[PDB]
Amino acid sequence: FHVEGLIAIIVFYLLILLVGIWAAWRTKNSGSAEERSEAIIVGGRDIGLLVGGFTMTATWVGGGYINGTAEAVYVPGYGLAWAQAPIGYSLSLILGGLFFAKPMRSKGYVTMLDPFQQIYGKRMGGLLFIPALMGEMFWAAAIFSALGATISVIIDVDMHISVIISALIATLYTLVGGLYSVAYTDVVQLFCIFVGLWISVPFALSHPAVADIGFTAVHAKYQKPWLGTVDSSEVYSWLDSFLLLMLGGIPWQAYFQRVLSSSSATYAQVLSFLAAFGCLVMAIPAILIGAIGASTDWNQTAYGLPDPKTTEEADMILPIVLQYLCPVYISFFGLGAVSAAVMSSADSSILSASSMFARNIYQLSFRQNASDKEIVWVMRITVFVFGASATAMALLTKTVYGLWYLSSDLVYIVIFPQLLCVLFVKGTNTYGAVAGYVSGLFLRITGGEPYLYLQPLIFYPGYYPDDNGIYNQKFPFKTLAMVTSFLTNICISYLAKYLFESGTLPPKLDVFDAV
Amino acid sequence: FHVEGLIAIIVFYLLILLVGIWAAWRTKNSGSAEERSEAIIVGGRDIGLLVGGFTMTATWVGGGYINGTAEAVYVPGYGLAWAQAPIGYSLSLILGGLFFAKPMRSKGYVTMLDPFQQIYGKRMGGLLFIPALMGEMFWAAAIFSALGATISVIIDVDMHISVIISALIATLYTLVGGLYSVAYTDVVQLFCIFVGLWISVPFALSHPAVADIGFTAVHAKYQKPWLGTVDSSEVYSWLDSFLLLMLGGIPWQAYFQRVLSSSSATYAQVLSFLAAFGCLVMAIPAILIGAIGASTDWNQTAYGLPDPKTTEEADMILPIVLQYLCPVYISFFGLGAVSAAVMSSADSSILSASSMFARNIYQLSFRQNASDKEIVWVMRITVFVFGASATAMALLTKTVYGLWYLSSDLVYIVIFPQLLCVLFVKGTNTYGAVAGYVSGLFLRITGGEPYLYLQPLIFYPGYYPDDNGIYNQKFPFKTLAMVTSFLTNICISYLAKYLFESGTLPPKLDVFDAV
């Protein structure tokens, strides 16, 4: 059982819990006494540059970002060219810092939905809250499932117990404390994941069993080369994936909660670049470990004859190299690193979802008149209930990954064009917003779901048949949908504004405010 | 001749020159119009945290810090344990940030010597200026010589031409601009050295000729192991070297010019830690390259049979691996990295020396009444003349390295105890300062000079005979001298204060101000 590993894990958990408790103690004079909700939600709009950069780049890298890259590098047929997580995340952060998040700090805003609830109606603000909430919960569930799998592989510990303990730790953090506590925990977690991941590269590379990883990047050894060039017949799919990972990670409440906490705007502008650099630095060891796993031969290690690819467990290729190609005291460090990244991403996501709901649904839509104590108690109970819901989804269900992918898709397709319209273009009244949202949502769900083999419905050129024969798509409908939403929103909003201006349609049926 | 390399070098030089010119253009409204000297010297006391950290950690790493570490790792009999540059620099920065540089920013100060000229007399302020000036010039000369050797090895270019061009570039930077221009150049130079050094590690490691670098760390292959454990009979020397590199890099005008430019004190406090982290990150590839050079066999590479150790050119072990174990387009990148680090350290040192002199010797000691234009012209001519002097010393002399070591020693032994006394303890009048400085200086020069085989004079236990038979020392006299200076300064200052207080010695002979 290696009781030393369990003791180290529990004392590390207690140490980060003590850090969170100290942060909660420190967070007692943030602002005056009648803005407790706003204070706990946005940290009092006062953090340092380094602390913000560290907490944000710890938020983005959360274990799934490591495992997906490692698996994509390792699994034959994907290669390195199909592991678009590093470049996608880095360029998404760079684009966000360049274009967005400067106006967000320019105005006095609390969450992502505040501009939306200000421009459109309260109904529209409550309606756009569903996709982002679903995406954040699904992401947290997937991250928790990945952590459970890693724990179960590393030590003979039940997945349920590990995920329950880690999630309870996350709720005990983000319930007793808010943004301050979560950022102070993420600062330590960043260093934990760095010292864990970057220290296991020389250990694995110098293994006698492993071959020359440079020879396999252009030649074949035990399998197809791990570089993985993309064929010309699938360039559209690669561009679609790049666009999704480039423009679908920017309209996330985790990003906007951290930008709307710096004392100024240039602080957040350079925070984005620091986060991108940290994301690249974190992605490098994952790529290296994936390459090591791809360019090594089993039947000489403690694993045995059947490779991970045949046994269909390549989703956890990282904690398999970290276990069978490194000593025990390096394996425990890497497990701690993965757990710390998972905890950081999970707590950040759950706090962002709670911050979105317990304000933009409760005090601006349902109870416009409520005491600060009531709202803070709603805050504290909402963090717990949403964490419990994410835990139940992660533990009692097995289709979490595909649902998470679909939820991220939906978040991108819905929020990003609407965020672009509300932040950059003028006009963009709710009359066109409803039509754009409906069109994008229905076009995406009719675009085809190939993971859960649910329904292809509308056929697009390419007609790719999977194992079940369900027709898969090739056209970039995942981004055609976003562009369709953008143009239809602009056109319909301007048409409504022009028709109202000319008086051709009677103002009697003006349901919303566009006169 | 590889004209592509020369073209790349000259266009890189022109690019950084354009960056410096743009910085000089930007630095035109720093403060009001009657503080031109103070503005050009301390950057207007307004820089960002990231810019300050980057410029400072680029200042510390300057090519010599790389070559010395690589040579110490490579040369047999030294090993890794005797390469105390990384830990020494990092802990010096950490100690500085913790203890010093908070009071420096607390008071309104311009250079290191301002507290000294304020507490002691103008004569004492002018007297302590000599050692730091000599140390900075000697360091710049050594760095320039190292760059010349690297250029001469990489390309068939005369050393004189390369050092002249690089030094002229440095003067053209720090003459047209001050702290702002030097920091804006160092920011780009940091990224240049990073992308140069850290990109040549996988290229050299994957060489067919090189052996397993992990096997040679505890075993012997072609030579003694490159780890290099320190014998128990030389522990005192190791502790002496560690103390020198730990407490002798803190009282340097390069450090205090960069701390006395941030808008606050916590900015500099965390700037020190950022600099230490950057220094460690820069030191890692140097250690790796030294290990690669130590654990590789010639007679299979383009070099030939005689190893660098036998030919006695191990001082440039880094640009030898970078040349014969990497392709041409990686060798040029590494050469650019080394040149950028050299330029950063040289320009920082020359600007610090000019800032010290042209203020604390000229406007507070000689011409108390002078126009701002006169002082700025003195600034601009002093930068050029000191750069030319450093260039002449680096080019026309061959004993630069040992003189630089002795100058750093002297700077440590003299400044650091006096800085400690003036910054921390009370009393410490000039009456004891004179005695402490004289005692430390004479004790150090009588402690023995083993490099230039000049004079051992006073014998200390150990009686180590070198090739010439000159007795070398073992006792930690290099730190005994500093502790002797500290205690004698404290004791003599307090004795003078007590004697003045009691009236036992008549106040007629009170030369200085201690009544």
Ligand SMILES: CCCCCCCCCCC(CCCCCCCCCC)(CO[C@@H]1O[C@H](CO)[C@@H](O[C@H]2O[C@H](CO)[C@@H](O)[C@H](O)[C@H]2O)[C@H](O)[C@H]1O)CO[C@@H]1O[C@H](CO)[C@@H](O[C@H]2O[C@H](CO)[C@@H](O)[C@H](O)[C@H]2O)[C@H](O)[C@H]1O
């Ligand atoms: C500046 C930055 C880089 C610095 C380091 C550069 C060099 C890296 C060296 C890597 C290194 C140390 C680990 C990393 C330390 C440094 C971490 C630094 C982190 C921070 C940067 C890898 O050695 C490690 O341990 C095992 C070897 O010991 C090896 O395999 C083992 O464990 C697997 C898992 O449990 C598992 O499959 C199985 O048990 C093994 O297969 C592991 O895969 C490996 O991780 C080198 O160790 C060298 O490897 C030698 C065999 O080549 C090894 O045996 C040699 O000596 C023996 C007598 O001592 C002698 O009897 C042997 O005959 C001789 O061969 C020695 O240990 C050592 O000489």
Ligand SMILES: CCCCCCCCCCC(CCCCCCCCCC)(CO[C@@H]1O[C@H](CO)[C@@H](O[C@H]2O[C@H](CO)[C@@H](O)[C@H](O)[C@H]2O)[C@H](O)[C@H]1O)CO[C@@H]1O[C@H](CO)[C@@H](O[C@H]2O[C@H](CO)[C@@H](O)[C@H](O)[C@H]2O)[C@H](O)[C@H]1O
């Ligand atoms: C992080 C940013 C930087 C990344 C840089 C990545 C590229 C680095 C260079 C690529 C590289 C490292 C791979 C590293 C993997 C991990 C990378 C990612 C890590 C981070 C995620 C692998 O290159 C592989 O090496 C093979 C040999 O092992 C070689 O030949 C194989 O395929 C052939 C058909 O193509 C086939 O005919 C052949 O039979 C195969 O054997 C191929 O080039 C290739 O397969 C090293 O190769 C570089 O070039 C030379 C060999 O080409 C190598 O030696 C040569 O040049 C010396 C100097 O001039 C000089 O002595 C000699 O001319 C010669 O000895 C260099 O020393 C090395 O530097």
Ligand SMILES: *[C@@H]1O[C@H](CO)[C@@H](O[C@@H]2O[C@H](CO)[C@@H](O[C@@H]3O[C@H](CO)[C@@H](O)[C@H](O)[C@@H]3O)[C@H](O)[C@H]2NC(C)=O)[C@H](O)[C@H]1NC(C)=O
């Ligand atoms: C992959 O794993 C297989 C496991 O079967 C390795 O097979 C090895 O084959 C050699 C050659 O026959 C065996 O050596 C001799 O085997 C006999 C039994 O037939 C034994 O009595 C002798 O004492 C001697 O060991 C070897 O045992 C066998 N390995 C094992 C574990 O039994 C094979 O080499 C591996 N590598 C590949 C296929 O690349």
Ligand SMILES: *[C@@H]1O[C@H](CO)[C@@H](O[C@@H]2O[C@H](CO)[C@@H](O[C@@H]3O[C@H](CO)[C@@H](O)[C@H](O)[C@@H]3O)[C@H](O)[C@H]2NC(C)=O)[C@H](O)[C@H]1NC(C)=O
């Ligand atoms: C270190 O360098 C020496 C260079 O002399 C290497 O010596 C090599 O020795 C082999 C074995 O004799 C030579 O192979 C044969 O040499 C004869 C000449 O005696 C030649 O006519 C044959 O065609 C064949 O090449 C080899 O040439 C020779 N190397 C050279 C460059 O001449 C030695 O192997 C190297 N490595 C060590 C000592 O570990």
Ligand SMILES: CC(C)CCC[C@@H](C)[C@H]1CC[C@H]2[C@@H]3CC=C4C[C@@H](OC(=O)CCC(=O)O)CC[C@]4(C)[C@H]3CC[C@]12C
């Ligand atoms: C996260 C990714 C998208 C960006 C950061 C990593 C890349 C900059 C690295 C990762 C792996 C590297 C590759 C690994 C191996 C090789 C083979 C190497 O050798 C050959 O192709 C054979 C000919 C030769 O040796 O020159 C050339 C560099 C290349 C393509 C490397 C180019 C740079 C790559 C793509």
Ligand SMILES: CC(C)CCC[C@@H](C)[C@H]1CC[C@H]2[C@@H]3CC=C4C[C@@H](OC(=O)CCC(=O)O)CC[C@]4(C)[C@H]3CC[C@]12C
């Ligand atoms: C700049 C320095 C002072 C600090 C940063 C680098 C060190 C943390 C690294 C550099 C080289 C490393 C060493 C390189 C090789 C080895 C051999 C390695 O294997 C053995 O000693 C044999 C037994 C075994 O394999 O466990 C153990 C780790 C060790 C000492 C490493 C320990 C960590 C070291 C000292």
Ligand SMILES: C[N+]1(C)CCO[C@@](O)(c2ccc(-c3ccc([C@@]4(O)C[N+](C)(C)CCO4)cc3)cc2)C1
């Ligand atoms: C080939 N697979 C293994 C199957 C699915 O396609 C993939 O290429 C893929 C595509 C997108 C993702 C993805 C993951 C997370 C997110 C996310 O919502 C998560 N964050 C919010 C954490 C940051 C980025 O946005 C978006 C896209 C993951 C895997 C990976």
Ligand SMILES: C[N+]1(C)CCO[C@@](O)(c2ccc(-c3ccc([C@@]4(O)C[N+](C)(C)CCO4)cc3)cc2)C1
């Ligand atoms: C064994 N050798 C090769 C011979 C001399 O002893 C060494 O260990 C050694 C000792 C100290 C140094 C040293 C170099 C620079 C400095 C410096 O003045 C330079 N900076 C101001 C740049 C930072 C540190 O302080 C101090 C000590 C260099 C080499 C190296």
